[PDB]
Amino acid sequence: SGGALAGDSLVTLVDSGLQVPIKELVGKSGFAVWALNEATMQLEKAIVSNAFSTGIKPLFTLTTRLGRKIRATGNHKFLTINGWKRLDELTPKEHLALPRNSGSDIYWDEIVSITYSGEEEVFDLTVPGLHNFVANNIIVHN
Ligand SMILES: [Cl-]
Ligand SMILES: [Cl-]
Ligand SMILES: [Cl-]
Ligand SMILES: [Cl-]
Ligand code: NA
Ligand code: NA
Ligand code: NA
Asked: 130 C-alpha to center of ligand 2: Å?
């Protein structure tokens, strides 16, 4: 529930640092990825309790000014300076929270494009602590 991501969306397994397509994690649990602690605004290790397909749904490709890109359902939420917002409520030039290249801080990158990009099978992770995770180096909410 809450939206989903293209199967090739990459999540980072904390200990190995291996970037893995979310589709490959289906059925796995009890492993850590990166997530945002919104109180500290710092990245933290977060346990995933479930990884699953939600079926075939419409996807939108969102691209940022730094060149980060993700394909998500219209209802998937991203973090703006004014709170979490559905992809299909985001506007051109609106900024989203993204992890910095190094360290545990975030930066607010500008959206340069949102484009409908067809239907595919889509996937999600449940993160029972922080309810969000990093995918394709962008913070997304459950
Ligand atoms: Cl678990
Ligand atoms: Cl379906
Ligand atoms: Cl909806
Ligand atoms: Cl919204
Ligand atoms: Na490591
Ligand atoms: Na604010
Ligand atoms: Na705007």
From this structure: 27
Cα 91–140–89 angle (5° rounding)? 25
Residue 16, Cβ density class (10 Å: 0-12 exposed, 13-18 middle, ≥19 buried): exposed
The experimental method is: X-ray
Q: What is the DSSP letter of 21?
A: E
Task: Give this entry's resolution in angstroms.
Answer: 1.4
Environment class of 53 (CB within 10 Å of its CB; exposed 0-12, middle 13-18, buried 19+): middle
User: Which ligand minimizes its atom distance to the CA of 55?
Assistant: 2
Q: Which domains, and CATH codes, for the chain?
A: 1-142 (2.170.16.10)
Could you say which ligand is closest to the alpha carbon of residue 127?
Answer: 1
Distance 83 CA to ligand 6 centre (A): 7
